[PDB]
Design an enzyme around this catalytic site. Structure first.
Site, PDB file in Angstrom:
ATOM      1  N   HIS A 256       0.830  -2.762  -0.522  1.00  0.00           N
ATOM      2  CA  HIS A 256      -0.426  -2.366   0.156  1.00  0.00           C
ATOM      3  C   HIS A 256      -1.512  -1.876  -0.823  1.00  0.00           C
ATOM      4  O   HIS A 256      -2.658  -1.761  -0.347  1.00  0.00           O
ATOM      5  CB  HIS A 256      -0.189  -1.321   1.267  1.00  0.00           C
ATOM      6  CG  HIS A 256       0.022   0.090   0.821  1.00  0.00           C
ATOM      7  ND1 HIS A 256       1.282   0.706   0.866  1.00  0.00           N
ATOM      8  CD2 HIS A 256      -0.876   1.055   0.462  1.00  0.00           C
ATOM      9  CE1 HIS A 256       1.142   1.971   0.461  1.00  0.00           C
ATOM     10  NE2 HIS A 256      -0.207   2.242   0.271  1.00  0.00           N
TER      11      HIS A 256
ATOM     12  N   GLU B 176       7.090  -3.999   1.213  1.00  0.00           N
ATOM     13  CA  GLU B 176       6.240  -3.134   0.362  1.00  0.00           C
ATOM     14  C   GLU B 176       6.528  -3.251  -1.154  1.00  0.00           C
ATOM     15  O   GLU B 176       5.865  -2.507  -1.907  1.00  0.00           O
ATOM     16  CB  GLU B 176       6.353  -1.686   0.831  1.00  0.00           C
ATOM     17  CG  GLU B 176       5.408  -1.381   1.982  1.00  0.00           C
ATOM     18  CD  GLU B 176       3.968  -1.031   1.544  1.00  0.00           C
ATOM     19  OE1 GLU B 176       3.577   0.144   1.747  1.00  0.00           O
ATOM     20  OE2 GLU B 176       3.279  -1.891   0.920  1.00  0.00           O
TER      21      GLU B 176
ATOM     22  N   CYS C 269       0.686   5.865  -4.528  1.00  0.00           N
ATOM     23  CA  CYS C 269       1.507   4.668  -4.237  1.00  0.00           C
ATOM     24  C   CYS C 269       1.532   3.709  -5.439  1.00  0.00           C
ATOM     25  O   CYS C 269       0.492   3.521  -6.075  1.00  0.00           O
ATOM     26  CB  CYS C 269       1.061   4.014  -2.926  1.00  0.00           C
ATOM     27  SG  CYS C 269       1.496   5.021  -1.477  1.00  0.00           S
TER      28      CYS C 269
END
Ligand SMILES: CCc1nnc(N)s1
EC number: 3.6.1.15
Lengths: 172, 171
Positions: free
Chosen positions: B28, B52, B137
């Site tokens: 993402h 992911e 992230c």
């Protein structure tokens, strides 16, 4: 950690020290250069030294760091408190190592006898090496923690076990 | 040499050089409009995606200064990993994570598949330097095993309170 805490951390002797206020500087006793007769432009005659084992405090006659406000220095911190050790590393990098503080202790580390507040690094399984743990040149780095509305300083880095997680914070 | 030089700003997050030609990140954070990454046209980049987890394999050496590392699909339960968080503030934040099962987890209301973990800073973890934020992230999960650093995934998500994190894994 806020930029005003990093700005207090100063390269000193074989490690670091930390400005508590414009007139007060704390460090680890063993990083102080033994031959030195002048610090920040002041002769030793103009400085009061307060020492307890590996803790040293310098009080200057004039404001050395007038850009700073005085902050709170505690004698260690409550059992279970999580601190950050504010370590400066290669290439302007800032390494705030998370540590859970424990009991007042006496230990033998790399053959040297050490006394202060013990703690365990919360960085990995073991903190062996420079990526997850401390190195000798980190001594004098400050132990800080965040409360509801401020930050406190509660000592300076004195020692660490090799292949371990255990550190010793020297305290006033 | 340092693992930290491998942690690279990328898109809305970070990624990690496993080798001179292999780069891993969180799906993402990847830009959704691009024709090149790191000076290499997308036409010569291989992209392997599993939820992911994303791996890029470049045609030429982007980081010829690095040796190739071990990449594994997560790690045994109870392993204490380190998440290597780089911050725009200028901070490097290695945090210990006790690893749990692979699962599909509800995190701040969305489904995330990966290896669960809990920070050792604990549930009453109190500040920017004791836990994760959304910008983190793609930060790698690593541990030392028998002389070698192992990379076993990338940071995908975290709870708002308490101490839960999710590591996206390969395959
Ligand atoms: C992206 C530039 C940075 N290098 N080190 C940091 N912590 S930010």
């Amino acid at each position: 950690a806020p930029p005003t805490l990093w700005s207090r951390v100063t390269k000193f002797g074989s490690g670091w020290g930390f400005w508590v206020s414009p007139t007060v500087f704390i460090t680890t006793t063993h990083v102080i250069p033994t031959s030195a007769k002048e610090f920040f432009g002041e002769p030793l005659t103009s400085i009061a030294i307060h020492r307890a084992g590996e803790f040293t405090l310098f009080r200057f006659s004039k404001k050395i760091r007038p850009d700073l406000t005085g902050m709170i220095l505690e004698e260690g911190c409550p059992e279970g408190t999580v601190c950050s050790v504010l370590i400066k590393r290669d290439s302007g990098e800032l390494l705030p190592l998370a540590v859970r503080m424990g009991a007042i202790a006496s230990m033998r580390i790399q053959g040297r006898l050490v006394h202060g507040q013990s703690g365990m690094l919360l960085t990995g399984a073991n903190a062996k090496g420079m990526d997850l743990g401390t190195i000798p040149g980190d001594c004098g780095a400050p132990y800080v923690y965040k409360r509801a509305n401020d930050w406190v300083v509660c000592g300076v880095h004195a020692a660490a076990t090799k292949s371990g997680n255990t550190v010793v914070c020297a305290v006033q």
